[PDB]
Every structure is written in structure tokens, then in C-alpha cells.
Design a protein around this ligand. Structure first.
Ligand SMILES: [Zn+2]
Ligand SMILES: [Zn+2]
Ligand SMILES: [Zn+2]
Ligand SMILES: [Zn+2]
Ligand SMILES: [Zn+2]
Ligand SMILES: [Zn+2]
Ligand SMILES: [Zn+2]
Ligand SMILES: [Zn+2]
Ligand SMILES: [Zn+2]
Ligand SMILES: [Zn+2]
Ligand SMILES: [Zn+2]
Lengths: 177, 177, 177, 177, 177, 177, 177, 177, 177, 177, 177
């Protein structure tokens, strides 16, 4: 027997109307699910990446999914505290993620980085909207948190595109395309 | 003989008109006094709480009043830097606190948590208004600080209501109301 | 609804007669009140001190009230262990404290340091009496605890006194009084 | 081939008469044996405690027997330092300990905590006696050391006492008495 | 041969139009250059300051230029990530700084602090405008960062004016102006 | 009023048949006893060892009984974890330990080291059988825990044996046997 | 004047038959000598590696020979602990190592990594053989220790393998084959 | 209003004739200017490097300018101790630096690394001369200080040079020049 | 031009009659002298001790004089704190120390340890009287400080005495006296 | 029973001729004795300093004598290592120190700092002489070590010099001359 | 397929003539070999040393070979840094080491310490020449690195020599030679 039913918003101890908490927590669950998806994906890439830049990429992928882990944790707690019910099942996570997970199998280094950049970008799009929704609704707490997370998320996307840039020390002695 | 008289706003080194600093510092003193009140109260509860959840509650109350201590410190410095005069006397603190302190004596665990939740809630109300006042007045510095503090304050209130929730491991073998 | 009334003393588990714990805890409340008064004052001094020796005085007041804070912790917790009820409201704090708080407003460096010294001296008075009373009444625990706190209290008094001394590196190139 | 016999006191390097060191070390071995019994009993409690407060009690017990281990260390070193022979065999520890160990088997949480409170209480009794003795015989060191230990041991008794207090957050939705 | 030409804005991985990134990165370069200027100046002051408050001022100047160093680092990375080209040459830094650097030579303690306060103040003015520009342009990421930096920058200016305040412990025994 | 009787094995949450947990936990209780005695003995030696090598041996005995205490912790919890009841009374420890404790009194340092070595060797034999048993019964968790403990226990025997070897720097200027 | 001869096994304090300790230590000295060769070769690689992946490889090599140094430590101590005599001269290390060192001079990065992969591979071969032997002869400790080492050593082999994988981010703008 | 003019040298307290400190401090200013130039360049490289080796180069430039920063600290502080006036304006920095800063804009990885190497080499030139001059003039302190910095400077030069080498793991599966 | 004459006691900020601070600080100055000499001696032994036990004794002498340095710090400050003038000249230290320093030259390690033990014992006697005095005069702060120092000082004597005991591992293979 | 006589040099293990070690250690004992005098004088200054700059000076003095303690350590160990006998008695330290200690009693802050500057200066004189000697006699180690120490000691002289500089923030509101 | 042949010196990025780097790096390779052998020997002694002083010597040998490993690191990199090829084969190490390794087998602890001392002394002689050479050739970086290593290497010889001195605590109760 249940204490909170999924999809529902309950009482919150911080004086916020449900006209605020319901859409806010709804957004949180899309963000939360999205980051579980990215966490899994970054973690995978960490596991499987190989090649000349394996070591750099290895470390980066691990840094990334830990940083994502911390985002998830802040959201989960605030989501619940605001009176919503955080998503956790595989199938519901799949239905709520804002990007499609990279398929099973090991792709190339470049493909992996591309897929992760696209992921962050999707997430950045939702966060910006959700921050704006929070601002208009007067939940400065939620807006502030989103902004914190956006900065870190946008930094990962910077790092991701720096990897993909068409430059190398090797161009001094290899034959370009 | 005095360098700054209480109730008065002086020169500030950060290019802000007194049409900003006077109401901002005024708000700060209400917040500051409020947190001294909560600090004292959380500290008391730390001292006196007992019962089955004594240990959990013991630790939480201590965490809480340290976190409040840090809020007070940021406010005090900014209040003074903006040219105001931070409140410090018992009687003035009493006149400016935004909630009434729990009375002398040891109440029950539940009563204590209730009283602290109500305290945070009061404070949350003022902070939201003061953040908005800062935003409109163009003191982004003060707004940002308030938002930082709001998030932590709202987290304590979450934790506080989780304590009060009518659930327990014991319900598996005790007789409910 | 209460469990313990202020001014009364209840069962302790450390096998001390109530004839001992009543004046000991009553003395502790006087010491606890005074120290919070002193903590509030040091903290204010930390916020508001300005001038040439600002930086030194600033971190010294910060040191002093963290130390005072730790006295408050140990005292409050023991006070309660002996079956006492610790003071925590602005009004009872005001009438139990053994010195007059610096009035609101910003005073000079020299004047702040001077009323901090006066405060510590008042407290040094009470603590010696309270210690004697505890030794006399056969409470080693309290006597020893008071002594720990006494040594650090006296030390602050030395440090305060050294700030006040009439010597400076500037006497080599500025006019004297 | 022996070198020192249990029961006899030997040379000490700290100018204490042997009429002082002999009862001081007798009292040490009683305190030492009693703290060994308490350490084991706490450890056992750490190992076996169950129920809704399991987590809290289980880490409280571990903090407790660690802190008791610390006492055992200081006492044995000073004991031997003063020319005494520390107890160490199961059979002798059994006869010197100032309280009877909990029986084998597992008891309930309220029971385990009461046992430990009774045990600390018996030891508070000895340490006060022994501390008086040392003060009387002019052995400041031992007196000072007993008081450090008394303070912590009295504090462990509060904390056991608070666990036992008939109060809970659960009283707000479970039937009393 | 070049990958990015100075003065130009390139692709950014965080879905921001160049109507946003171009003015934002432009502002960043003015801020960046400004902080290099202050870093140098604070570092100099650290090197050369002497007199009665040499030690306090020594430490403060060093704290300050490290804190400025961290501001520079966040800006540089975000500037580049947004697709701009961070300034780094002496002459371009000089043309873009928002205040004039203090001249070569060692000035007095007071003059140095005055010059640094004026520097911060200049920078505060630009940051407030650039934060507002970011807000209106919808770059919450950049706005948030600026706000972070503003708070620290405004704190240094507070500390700076506290140094300059016309108060001293010495006034108890020296002859005022 | 007990919950579990010493000598019975109760239910476990790790899917092990009681034909497995009964002998396993019997075994654990012998090893707990033995380590418990070894700890006391190690600690005693630490308390009393003197002579030329006093400092090395002091340090070593300390490290030794700390490490043994870690073993006791792991076993005690897994003993209880498998539905066993851990031994904690002086009387039952003596009956279950696999070696006979050093007698009361201080022995020579060589005799102490020899006594500890024989203690470790008594415990090594019990662990190898008890590990061999758990392998055959299907308890990999217990088998692995034992091998972990065996490795450290064998290392203490190496170190013990080295202390006892008939070599010394002094052999270059003192007479041999 | 010798005391133990290389080649012979001597007394051990851990109740292992000498028919066990003799082949176990022979295998140790082979593993020990092979890890010395690998350590040197890694070190060399650390010293000499160049090219676009220099930084990554150069810190990977350092992590690697550090982790190999750790193996060398555990093995030598147990070796000697078991009554063996560890190899230590250049000439004998040369004949016991299970793989031929890379020749003097500097090779390429792809070459250095292949050499190290071949070296780890040869050692994985020995450790499995030796681990089987120890299990067979009833020496759990040695078996357990070989497996700790096998795990890390297999993991170093993945990482060398991944470096060698024919994939790169550079494939997106440089010509393959 | 000045206290010390740039280009002039004043009283030191370390008993060195002004004939020594004048060329030593003048050399220090050349070295200080160059290193800030280098610090600005490494920092820019840290901001802007992109491509396959981005991650490695990124944290290497970060390491390099923290190290360079520490050279700047020691040099500036000693320069002033010898009675000198340290350079800190953009214009005098430009004319004292012993190499030409990389022009504005983003260059290739290889090209960045290449002008960092050129910069270090120019500085290695000056430092050897300045060191010789200091030994020659009888200033051990400076000679030694230059040597500390020389060793780390040369080391960066090695590291830079290794990035530039024409070897890569990619040469096994990409076309050569 | 003095501010305070050695041999006078001046004003104190801790409310103590000069009939108390005069004898107390006389006493402090004897103990400061004595510890100051003991530090030199401890440090010397550290510099020169050799032989078989050189390493243990090296470590121990080091720890010993560090700990003594801590004592010197506490006394010196409280000496000055009570309005005394602390001794710092070589000549006045010799006249005031309560034991005669070991003569110049290296003695045997046994003689060094014996000399340190007699030093500690000389200081123990002075501390017990000086503590006894402060108890009777009403200076609890001083009495407690002394007991703190007494405890550590007695422990060094334990350790010293243990080094001197006529036991050794070597007694199992070298000839006795 | 002596083993080495003060004044004579003995065997050293580092292949330095005794014609080298004898003057090098004479110079060591002069440096050693002078640093002991400085350490005491700094300590004294730490204990006694008062006035508006008390806090700054009081922690500067403590950093200073700690850093001097470090010198004393390196010098004594090398001294003895080179076969010398380190000075350690009050009377001999008095005659070997290269500067006369400040007299007993307390002086002013400007006075204490001048004394310490004079003291460091005298020592800078010796260390340069001794460093030249060591270079000349071919003892690189000692030369290198003297230069490490010279650098710090010259740096302590700057800092003392800066304290003394006739400049203050107070000049902007107090009357000069 | 090599890139560099052992025995050739190649190009360097630190502006040194090959008439300098050729002899310098030849020298480095002898010292690398020698330290490499010394490390093995130090580590061996660590593996096998036993007897009364086993614990001290155990610790010391460990510290010793760690410190030697640090030397090997610095040389190896600067060797390669100067365009040299570092030795890493067993065969070439033997031919280049400047001392002959201790033979296989365990020797007495005194013989081990004596062997290490002669090893250090062999290496001290090589370093002094190799440093003398680099001074004359103009390689200050190498000269300074050597002096750094010389200082620590001389200290290990001090410590080695002290272990060997004919003194012991046991001389007060065992027969001399
Ligand atoms: Zn959490
Ligand atoms: Zn603060
Ligand atoms: Zn507490
Ligand atoms: Zn101990
Ligand atoms: Zn960065
Ligand atoms: Zn546990
Ligand atoms: Zn080891
Ligand atoms: Zn500095
Ligand atoms: Zn201090
Ligand atoms: Zn040392
Ligand atoms: Zn390295």
C-alpha cells in the first residue's frame, strides 16, 4: 500500500502553491530521467572507449558521469521535498528522457563524443525552459538550482566540442583527409 | 562615542544608492535577527532532545544550527559592507525576529520539530520578499546571496517535514492511533 | 504541552543528588547566557570592525567567538545531562547574563576591545565561583569542565589586553598624546 | 621466566611513594577490568542490535566502545608507568570488574541500553572514589586523568539516558501505554 | 596559420545565437582584461607594501589576487566555450581594461588601497551591466557566473574600504590630524 | 528476557541453509574468542614491554592489537549476520579461545614475543580449517573473509618471527652465547 | 659471513610444510624478478615516451610502475616471510624473469605499449600457474595474494590493449590506412 | 605621491652593496616581465586548446602556468627585498619581456606548443646569464633562486619538446606525411 | 628603553591579586628555564645519539623536544599574560633552570637517557610544588595548566625509564653481566 | 663516561677530509648557537609583544622562530653527521653566538623588530662567510644547505625591514613627526 | 625499429652544446645504474632484515629505497630531457653501476648496513665529480640537481654510520668485546 502515488504532487513545507510545484516537479522528472540516461551513457563510454586518446577520454567520461550523478542527487531531493514523486523505473525513465540513448554496442570515439554532446544539448534546452518556468512561477529556489546545473552542463558541452575539433599535434606528420 | 548609529545607513564602496542599501540592509537585519533566533532554538533542541530518535535528531539539530550560523555570517558581513549596522542586542533581536521563539522548557520531539519547521517557514517568507526587493532594486549581489540561503533553508524544511511524516519501521509491530 | 519546566531540575543518570545539580545547573545557565551574549558581541565586532588594524581584529573576533561557541556547546550539553533546562529565549538570556552587552551601533576599535575585555572579566568572575562551588559540592566533572573553559577565557583576556597596550610601530614616526 | 608479579607494585620513575602507587594501581586495575567488560559489552551490542533504531544504536555503540578503548589505553599505560601490573587474563578481569556483564545471548534494544547505562553508572562510582583517593595521596596526574575520563563517561551516561526517555516522534500516530 | 581570429565569434555547443554570444563574449574580454590588470596590481602591492600594517596588507593583497585569478579562469573558459577568443597580449589587455593601472613605482599603503578600491569599483560597474545584458539576452549561465563573481568582488571592496576607515587602536595614544 | 539464546543459530537473510550457518558460526565464535584473547595479550604487551627494543615493540604491539581489533569487528558482524550469537562474557571467552592466555605478570620481551607468535600460530591453524570448511559448505563470503584475515595474521607471524631471530647490530661489539 | 643461501628454503613461522614453501618461493622469485624487469621497462617508458599522446602515456606509465612496485613489495615480504630468499642481483633477475626486456635505446609509442602488453601477458601466465600450485598445496594466503595481483595485472593489460586499438578522434579529419 | 621611483634602487637590509642589487634587480625585472608574458600565454593556451589531445594539453598548460606563477611570486618578492621596484604595467611589461607573445587569436596545438617552447628557451637564456651575474657579484641567494627556477623551466622545455616529437599511437593505422 | 623590568610583576587582565601573580610567575620563569634547558638537551641527544637503538631513540628524542616546546609556549604566554616578564637570556636561563645541563660532548646513549630522566624528575618536583602553590593561592588556571603538563612530563619519564630497563631481545643469544 | 669531546672532529661517513669537516663544523656551531639565540629572542618577542599591531607581530614572530627551529635542525644533524659535536649548554651558546641577545625585560615593538633585524643581519654575515668556506674546501652539501638557509634568512630580513618602514594607513588621519 | 640508439646523445630543447650533454648524460646513466642497484639492495634488506633491531631497520630500509627511487626519477627524466637514452636492461645496469651489488643470500644486519654504507659512499664520489664537471661545462641545472641529491645521499650515510656505531642501551647489562 502506497504513501505517494506517481504523477501526483503532495504537500510541501516551503509555502508554494501547487500551481507552482506541480509543473516544477513535472519538469524535474524529465530532467532527472534525462540525467539518468546520460549518466548511464557516460558510464558506458567510460567502460568501452579505446584508441589513441583512450586515457584522456577514459578520465573525462568518468568525471562527467560523477558530475551528472551530483545533478541527479540535488534534483531528486528537491523534487521530493517540493511534494512530487521522483521517477526510478527503467520504463518510465525511458518515456521521460529528453533524448534517445545511444544504442547497444561500442561505437567509435568520435561517435561517442558526438552522441554525448547531442545529449547535453537536449538537456540544456529543457533546463533553460524549466529555469524560465520556475522564474515566472516565483520558485527562485528551483531556478537557482537549475542555473547551477546549467553552468556545469554547458561546461561539459564545451569540453565535448573541444574533443571534436578538427585539430591535432599529429597533423605535423600525418596526412590529412 | 560612536562610528555608526543603529538604524542608519552609511557610505558603501560598491556604487549603490541608499534608495537601495537602506531597504536592503533593513531586510538583512530582520533576516539576521530571525536566524539568531533559530540558531538559538536549534541549538537548544540539540541540547535537550531525547527519546527513540534522539541520536538522529541530535545530529540533525547540530547540523542545522551550524548551517544557520553560516547564513548569519554572510549576511552580517554584507549588511555592514553595504553600510548598515548589524543588530546584536538581545532586546533588539527580539523585536526584529520574524517568528516567536519557542518558550523556555523542554517540549516533546514532535513539538520541537514542528516549532522549527514553522520557524524556517516564516524565514522563507521574508527571504522570498527580500530577494524580490533586491531584484527590483538592482542589487543582484544581495539577491544571489538570498537565493543561496533560500535553497539551504528550504532543504532544512524538507528534512524537517520528513521527520514529521506519519510513517515508521515500527508500524510493522506496534498499534497505530 | 511541556515535559520539563524552566527553573526546575530533573532526574540525572550520573548519580548526583539534586542538592548538587540545582545550583550547578543554575550557575551553568548564568554562564551559558553570558557566553551567548559574548558570542553575539564578538560576532558583531567581527562584522563591524574597521580601520588600520581591521584585518587582525577581524580574524581575532572570528577566532574568539568560535571558541566561545565551543564553550556554549559543552556547557549546554552538560547542563542538560545533569537534569537541567537550558536558557534559550532572548528575554531570559538578557536577565541571566552577568554583563551588559555593548549597545547597538558601531563603536571604535579600542572601545569594542575594551568591552570585550570587560565581558570576559565578568565571566572569569562567575566561572571561578561556579568552579569553587562545584569542587565544594563534589562534582569533579563540572569543576574540571569549568577549568578547561577558564584557561581559554583568561587567554582571550590576555590577548584583548595586548591590543589595548599603548605601543605601536607607528610611534617611531607619528606624534604622541 | 617472570619479571614482575601481579599484585605487587614496583619501581616508578616519577617520585611517587609506593604507598601512593599501590592503591592507585589497584584502583587502576579495577577501572581497567571494568572498562574491558564495558568494551566487550558495547562491542557485542554493536554486533547484535536490531530494530527500527538499529542504525542509530549500532553507530552509537561503535563510537562508545572506541571511546572506551581510548580510556583503557591511557589507564594501562599509566598503571604500568606507575610500576603496576595491568590485568589481562579473562579470569582475573572477571573478578576485578565493578559490574556483572550482560549474559550471553541477545537482548532487546531497550534492554541493551539499560545494561550499558547501569555499567557506566557503576564505573562512575569507582572513578569518583579513585579520583578522591589520588587527590588525597597527592597524585595530581592520576586525579587529572580520572577527571578527563569521568567527563566522557558521564557524557556517555546522558546519551544512554536520552535513548531510554519515554518520548518518540511515533507518538503522534501510534497508541501509547 | 589561425584557427580563430581575434574579435570574431565562432560556433558554440550550447545552442546560443550569436546575437547573444557576440556581445556576451565581448563583455567577457573587457572583464577578463580588467581582472588581469587588477591581478597584476594586487600582485604588485603584495610585493611592495610596507609599514605598520604590512603583514595584514601583505596577506590580504595575496588573497585578493588569487581570488581574482579564479575569476579570470572561469571567464576565460566560458568566453572560449561560447565561441569567442580570449584576450592575452599586453597591448590588447591595455586597450580593453576598464580602469587605468596604477603607475610604476611604490606608493603609500593608503594610496595603494585607494587605487585597488577604485579598480574593483570600475569592474563592479561593468559586471552589473554585463550581467543585465546577459539576463536580457537569455544567457542565464553567463548571468549566474557574473553574479558569483560580483559577490566576491563586492566583498573585496568592502574589505578595502574597512582598511581605509579613519579609525585605529593607536588613536588611544597618538595625536590625530 | 532474551530474544536469542547463545548456542542456537537463527534465521539469516543471505539464503544459506542452517546446515551451513550452524557450523560456520560455531567456528566464528571460536575465532572471535581467540582474537579477543589475543587483543588483550597484544595490548598488555604494549602496556608493559620495556628494554632496549621497547620503542619498536611498543609501536608494533599497538599496531598489532589494532589490526586484530579490525578482525574481531568483521567476524562479529558476519557471525550475527548469519543468524549467530556472538560470545562476549569473560567466562565463555576463556572456554572458547583456541590458545591459553599468557599468565598475569610481566614476562621478558622475548617471552612476550614468543607467546604472541604461538598465539598467532594457534589461530592460523583454526582459520585454515574453518576456511577449508566454508569452501566445502558453499559459503564463499566466509571463505574469502577468512583468507583476508589469514593473510594479515600470517604477516604478524613473519614479523613476530623476525623479532626473535638471533641477529643484532650489537653482535659487532658484545659477546655471543 | 652468510646466514641464508639463495636457492634453499628455511624456517617459516606459519605452519606451512617446506614441500609447500619451496616451490611457492621459487615461483615468487620468478614473479618477483619478472615484476622487476617490468618495473624498469615501465620506468624507462615513462622517461622516454614522446609524441602527441606523450602526456597520457607518460602518466599512465608512472601509475603502472608504481602499481608494479606495490606487487614487488607484497611478494618479497611474503617470500622472505615464508623462509625464501628474494632475488636481488642484476644477473640473477635476468635469468628468472619470464619475459625478455625491451632492448636499450628508444622505441616508438605503439612499440613501447606492445612490449609492455607482451610483458604483462607473460606474467599473467606465471601467476595463474603459481596460483593453481598454491591452491593445490593448500597455501591459501599465497593463492589469495596472487589473485589480488592477477586482477590488477589483468586490468593493466586491458588498458594497454585499449591504447593499441585502431581508433582515434583524428580519423575524422586524417586519412586512414 | 611617490615613495620609490621605477628604475631606481633603494636601501636593502641584507647587507648587499647597491653595485650588486642594481643589475640583479634589473635582471629580475626582465625575468619577472617575461614570466608574466609566459603566464598569460600558457593561460590562453589553457583556455583555447582544442582537438584530439585537448584534454592532456589543457591540464598541462594549467600545470605550467601555476608553476610559472610561483616563479613570479618568488622573484617579485625578492626583487623588492633587494630594494628594487617591480614592473607591473602592461606597457613596461611589454618592453622588458625577452620574447614576443603569440599574437591574438587561436593557433593550432602544434603552434601553441611551439611558441611556448620558444618563450621558455629565451627565458632559459636570460636566467643563465642572470645566474652567472649573481654568482659573479657575490649574491648566493639570487644565484640559488635562479637555479631552482632554472631546473623547472628546463623541465617544461623537455615536456613541450616531447609533445612536438613526430610519433603517435595513430601511426599504426593512419597515413604518414 | 624598557617597558617592563625583569623581576617585576605588572598588571594583569584576569582579576588576580599581585600577591598571587608575583609568586606564580616567579615559578613559571623557573619552569620555562628548566624546559628551555631540557629542550636543548633533548634536541642535542637527537642530533648525536647513535648505536643499535639509534633509530628508536632518534625518533623519540625528536618527539620529546617537540612536546617540551609545546609546554614552553603555554607557560611563556600565561607568564606574560599574568603580567610577568619571561626569561630569554642564556645567562639568566642557567641561573634559573632547576637541573644542571648535560656537559658538552657526546655521552653514551644510556647516559643520555639517564640524564634526560633525571632532568624530567627535577622538573616533576618543581611542577608539583608550583601546582600545589597555585591551588592554595586561588589560581585554578595555572593549577590546571600545570596538571596538563605534569601528565605529559610524567609520561616521558615512563618512556625514559623503559628504555633503561635491563631487558632485551638479544638476551636470548648474547652474554649477560 | 664521555665518547666525543667538544672541540674535536671525529670520523665521518661521507669522504670529506678532516681538514674540511673541522672548520665547517666550527662554523656550524657558530651558526647553530646564533640561531638558538635568535630562536629564544623571537620566542620571547612572541610572548611579550603588545600594542595595536600585536596580532600581526605575534604571529609573525611565531612563524619566524618556527622557521629558525627548522634551520637549527638541519644544521645540528649535518654538524654531527660530519663528525662534529653540536653546542648545547647555555654557557657555550652564549660565547659562540654572533650577536648579543636582547637584554631581559620587555622592550617596545619597534625595538623588538629592530633587534631581530640586527640579529638576522649578523647571521647573514656568518652564513655568507661559511658558505664561501665550504665552496672553497669542496663541501657542496654544506654550501647548498647554507644557501637554502640564506634565502629564508634574507627573506625574514625583508619582512622585518618592511615592519619598520615609516608608512602606515594611520597617516591619513593622525599627525606625523 | 628504434628511434634512438643507446650510446648516442641526441638533440635537446634547453640550448646546451652536445659537448656538454654528451658527458653529462653519460654521467647520469652511471648514476641511474648505481641508484637502480642501490634501490634493489635497499629493498632486499627491507625484505630480509631480522633480529632485535629488525623493526627500526625495516622502516629505515623502506624509507631509504623510496628516497632513492625519487633520485632515479629526477635523473632519468633530465637524462632523457638532455637528449640522452636511459639504461634499463639488467645487463647494461651491471656494467654501468659504480659499486658491486651485495651477493644473493641473506647476510647479517650489520653486514647489510655496512654494504649499504659502502654503496652510498661509492655513489657520493661519482656525484661530486659529476657535479664538478657540470659546473665547469656550464650546466647549472644538472649541477644543482646533483647537489640536491648529494645532500640526501650524504644523510643516508650519516644514518647508516650511526647504526654501525659501537653503542647500545644493552651495554648496561650485557658483556662487551
Ligand atoms: Zn542526500
Ligand atoms: Zn568573516
Ligand atoms: Zn553536541
Ligand atoms: Zn600507547
Ligand atoms: Zn581550467
Ligand atoms: Zn560496524
Ligand atoms: Zn614493507
Ligand atoms: Zn608572498
Ligand atoms: Zn602563541
Ligand atoms: Zn631529525
Ligand atoms: Zn615524472
Amino acid at each position: 500500500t502506497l504513501l505517494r502515488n506517481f504523477g501526483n504532487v503532495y504537500d510541501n513545507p516551503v509555502l508554494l502553491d501547487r500551481s507552482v510545484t506541480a509543473p516544477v516537479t513535472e519538469g524535474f522528472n524529465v530532467v532527472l530521467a534525462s540525467f539518468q540516461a546520460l549518466y548511464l551513457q557516460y558510464q558506458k563510454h567510460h567502460f568501452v572507449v579505446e584508441g589513441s586518446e583512450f586515457y584522456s577520454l577514459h578520465e573525462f567520461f568518468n568525471e562527467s558521469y560523477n558530475q551528472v550523478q551530483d545533478h541527479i542527487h540535488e534534483i531528486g531531493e528537491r523534487l521530493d521535498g517540493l511534494g512530487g514523486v521522483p521517477v526510478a523505473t527503467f520504463s518510465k525513465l525511458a518515456e521521460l528522457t529528453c533524448f534517445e540513448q545511444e544504442s547497444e554496442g561500442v561505437y567509435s570515439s568520435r561517435q561517442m563524443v558526438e552522441n554525448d554532446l547531442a545529449a547535453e544539448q537536449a538537456i540544456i534546452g529543457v533546463i533553460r525552459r524549466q529555469a524560465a518556468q520556475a522564474e515566472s512561477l516565483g520558485d527562485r529556489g528551483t531556478r537557482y538550482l537549475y542555473e547551477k546545473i546549467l553552468l556545469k552542463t554547458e561546461e561539459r558541452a564545451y569540453h565535448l566540442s573541444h574533443f571534436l575539433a578538427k585539430d591535432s599535434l599529429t597533423l605535423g606528420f600525418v596526412q590529412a583527409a
